A paper describes a structure:
In this study, we focus on the ω-transaminase from Mycobacterium vanbaalenii (MvTA) which exhibits activity toward d-fructose rather than fructose 6-phosphate. The transaminase MvTA demonstrates transaminate activity toward d-fructose 1, and the resulting 2-amino-2-deoxy-mannitol (ADM) 2 undergoes dehydrogenation under the enzyme GutB1 and spontaneously cyclizes to produce the valuable azasugar mannojirimycin (MJ), which serves as a precursor for 1-DNJ. The dimeric enzyme exhibited the characteristic structural architecture of class IV PLP-dependent enzymes, consisting of two subunits. The interface between the two subunits constituted the binding pocket for the amino donor and acceptor.
A mutant M9 with significantly enhanced activity and thermostability has been successfully obtained and crystallized for structural resolution. Based on the level of thermostability improvement, the additional five mutation sites (S105P, S121M, H152N, A168E and R215G) were sequentially incorporated into M4, resulting in the generation of mutant M9. The activity of M9 was measured as 39.4 ± 1.5 mU/mg, demonstrating a remarkable 16.4-fold increase compared to that of WT. In all three structures, the asymmetric unit comprised two polypeptide chains forming a homodimer. For insatance, the Lys195, located on Loop2 (Chain A) and Loop4 (Chain B), served as the catalytic residue, and the flexible loops of Loop1 and Loop3 were likely involved in substrate binding. The results suggested that the mutations in residues surrounding the substrate binding pocket (L162I, H69K, K145R and K142P) had minimal impact on thermostability, while the mutations in residues positioned on the surface (S105P, S121M, H152N, A168E, and R215G) notably enhanced thermostability. Through further rational design using the crystal structure of M9, the mutant M9-1 with an additional 1.9-fold improvement in specific activity was obtained.
Numbering used by the authors:
A (entry chain C): 19 to 336
B (entry chain A), D (entry chain B): 17 to 337
C (entry chain D): 18 to 337
The structure:
């Protein structure tokens, strides 16, 4: 755990881990073996390294509840299929290994990763895709924040990069979650150099794409919009649209132009790693009053209440 | 296997020799977290952000008849990319040279694919957020020779398509001017080439200018002058060598935009990379270039390239086995 | 003027005689508030609609003496004018009245009708200050222009995806506002003609379908229709096609259509004011379906032509 | 109408002369369908596909102190672009030169903006579709001098922004390497620069490389070397002149990609164009370039460029009035 704002909707669990188990605090599952995370190593010759030839997903565990594991496995497996990767495990088999990683970890708040790689052959530097055995790697480790708890509650700041744009769907395709962060990293660097929390990247046509590890939603005239084309089909975004529909807020996946981002009444980053993050400022200009907007507060607070409501989560049997 | 067939009497012949397999380094070495290891033992932390974020750069050098080719030039390119990415190898050029050559020496390979990678690395604990807290890692390996195109295709040529569905990432995205493992577009291009029954793909950039192929630079010949893309392409050391050879032969060679029209109107196309050298491209979208057979400039430059690997000079250093 | 159309096809010109005693007979232009015979129609070389192509326009057709969806065209024309910061200085109902008088005076029952709004010119040639330019409205009704010959409307045309050209994106020369800036379209048409094809289907920056030289592209896949949403003119023919599809129980979506989905389509059609709905039989020489007009394309095209003879809100008969 | 204020003692000064208005050509001449007309009277067919399709190319030459600048180069670039578009002017270079110089003479203007346009034209029928059936048209005019930037800004400099919402059309769309009237992107950029209270816009291409501005090339100076975009930009005659001027001063000048990083980090930025020459850019996105005053290479190149309008030589030719 770490500090969250007092009385805010984000609070870690009160519990102590039994460290007599060497799995305590973090677990990896690799080449069919459960390992302490600090022991988790892969072949340097996995073409998931050499070619970043792989897809992944991340799911969070909050108050011992893993959130939308099924929706996560469905997007993982659909992406795997598109890349011609084969986990060699069923959805239900991967669910049980994931859940057992969390259980061994004893973590009630956990960042959880499933990665499917093209893998390695019998020989180092085997090139025939046909001779490479695809690898599944899973791990469960302490909760990770794209933005700190206090920014979740009080908001962060963004810039649109001067020097970077998002890779297009016809290049390094962002519609399949991948580890190819060349643009996303350069954009994070540009945001830190300019003293800003994060970056919102544009596509080739000056429509919003996404940010380094999150989707973007804007609110204008009480209506929500998130980019349809050059962005990951996020599960936090999916959750946010379900929330909005329940609240009677119109929510469209469509092209959001550069004009629309700069003219927004609210902007938010949505992601598995910390949920809903208000963006108070864009290029050093406040959005609305420069404090988290009211649709972003309502959806963020609703998001975190979901994590204690039996329904679309499952308690880890710790 | 330390060897495979090459066309009999061609300019491509592996070395005749025997590896002493009592040594456990025999046939492949990796240098990981300061330790020499048999290639097959070689593992990195899954929490290296060179995996999780492909936050790294690298170079590939080849060894042919016991000679490492242009190691100086590959360490210059590697460390300049590393500096642009704000990576620090924590080793000097001269130190990385010695560690590379000891990998080859220990492997006993006379023909070798050599990789130097520099990753952003990991922190004290897994998924460290703060970049300032990640320790950059360098990995080096020397394994048996890898061919971007088979020996047979080096001599008889390959075929190529321009993808219907794919383009090269631009320098303002995942920047191709810094060697990287971010191959999403290159893997896609390769699949589309394979589905279309072709040897390979030649990717266009956003402006319908030639970029490069999956693991190689493209050079064209038109009316006896040679050209290769300047923008959305790795500054290849093979391409640098090709330009030097053209220059010596009195052939004009230019780094400039090659338009889609220029690719399609070319008298010769060739692929050039460390991993196999100079590959003639006979056809493009099922239309013969020249006569459908390797071009005269391609052949002369390729044969000179392979002659370079046996000539005492500044481009090669003999591994002291 | 009229043209051979296939015998018994849904496309037939009117049978009628023009009175060539009137100098307006066969083609009218409305320029600087004066009605002229098409052939006398001239604009200042110094109109920045020329030297900058700083303008928007629309095209409506007249078929069997009925002008089709003039209100929709005026709405799109004026919506674009406002986004280019142009002022026609005439209301919708005024332009509607001028347009209908152009056709009446032409006596054409089958007509290509242009409305252009340019930034215009100042008191001097070469005026710099955009604010000192008087915006111009130009309107003509001339004989019917075919984006594809009547024969091709009935029996289909052939398409290529250009090797050398892409559609200008919405952040450059914006295709979502009808314009005369055809550099890409003209390039794409030359490449199609050089490759012996009927026309070109252009991609955008991301390998999504944009549109063709003067038309929207619709695909059919597994009985469902789709048409690009981003780098494409919001076509009024496309709009009719969607309305028809809806009434037929055919699902129809404005969305991204990938290069994949174009090459894998069960049907491809072009849709434009200048000739309606054209089957695309072949793409880069490969048959689409059986290489003859697809079933959904035929049903929708034949419906589209029937709309031009049915009393109702989409047509208005010209009072000759 | 024929002169406006220039800064006193500046290198930019209009000529002292009186025009005889007993000529109907005095102060503006157009040549349209083989007839000389007063500018005021110059009209084209609304059915010219140079209008309805902007299917055309053109060039602009300036006259200064009764001298027309590089008319030969302008005719070469015009005719090259017309052949690329499969336009045929129906006149030779020397015939176009004779008519151009005769427009300037009938104008009586010593300072003049001179436009040659070649259009695809019209057929016998309004709205002919077959390009084979269209008669290519030539339109030439000579009107009073036109300033992309006012004289004051030529001497004391202007301010630029990079657009937030607009990019230059690439060479594979509406090609900027062939001078054209298709200003959709450039007009939107000017409107964004005006809304942002800035002198002008410098547009980027798809790869975040500098393209050009609305009606001008961009040059940057860095560590005393000059660079100007090679790809998505008109090969400008002013830029050509600046590069010749740069070389005669011992300043290195490259046509190459200028990244977004190079533009923002420039020691000097200048706009170069036929309509007013070399304009210093003092500020980019409100950030001063150098000391926020015209740069030393900018000033030296500009002052030399205006001296070229008086020196007898191959760059200028006296109009016989």
């Amino acid at each position: 755990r770490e500090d969250t704002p007092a009385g805010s909707v984000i609070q870690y669990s009160d519990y102590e881990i039994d460290y007599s188990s060497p799995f305590a605090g973090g677990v990896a599952w690799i080449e069919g073996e459960y390992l302490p995370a600090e022991d988790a190593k892969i072949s340097i010759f996995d073409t998931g390294f050499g070619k970043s030839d792989l897809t992944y997903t991340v799911a969070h565990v909050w108050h011992g509840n893993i959130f939308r594991l099924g929706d996560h496995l469905d997007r993982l497996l659909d992406g795997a299929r598109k890349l011609r990767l084969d986990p060699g495990y069923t959805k239900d088999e991967l669910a049980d290994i994931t859940k057992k990683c969390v259980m061994l970890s004893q973590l009630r708040e956990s960042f959880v990763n499933l990665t499917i790689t093209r893998g390695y052959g019998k020989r180092p530097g085997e090139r025939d895709l046909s001779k490479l055995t695809n690898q599944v790697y899973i791990y469960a480790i302490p909760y990770i924040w794209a933005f700190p708890p206090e920014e979740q509650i009080f908001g962060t700041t963004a810039v649109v990069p001067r020097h970077v744009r998002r890779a297009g769907r016809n290049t390094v395709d962002p519609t399949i979650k991948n580890y190819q962060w060349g643009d996303l990293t350069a954009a994070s660097f540009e945001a830190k150099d300019r003293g800003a929390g994060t970056a919102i990247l544009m596509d080739a046509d000056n429509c919003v794409a996404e940010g380094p590890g999150f989707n973007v939603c804007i609110v204008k005239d009480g209506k929500l919009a998130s980019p349809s084309r050059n962005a990951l089909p996020g599960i936090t975004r999916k959750t946010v649209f379900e929330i909005a529909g329940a609240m009677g807020i119109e929510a469209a996946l469509r092209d959001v132009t550069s004009h629309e981002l700069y003219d927004a009444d609210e902007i938010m980053a949505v992601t598995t790693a910390g949920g809903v993050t208000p963006i108070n400022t864009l290029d050093g200009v406040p959005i609305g009053d420069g404090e988290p907007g009211p649709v972003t507060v309502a959806i963020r607070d609703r998001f975190w209440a979901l994590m204690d409501e039996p329904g679309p989560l499952i308690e880890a049997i710790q």
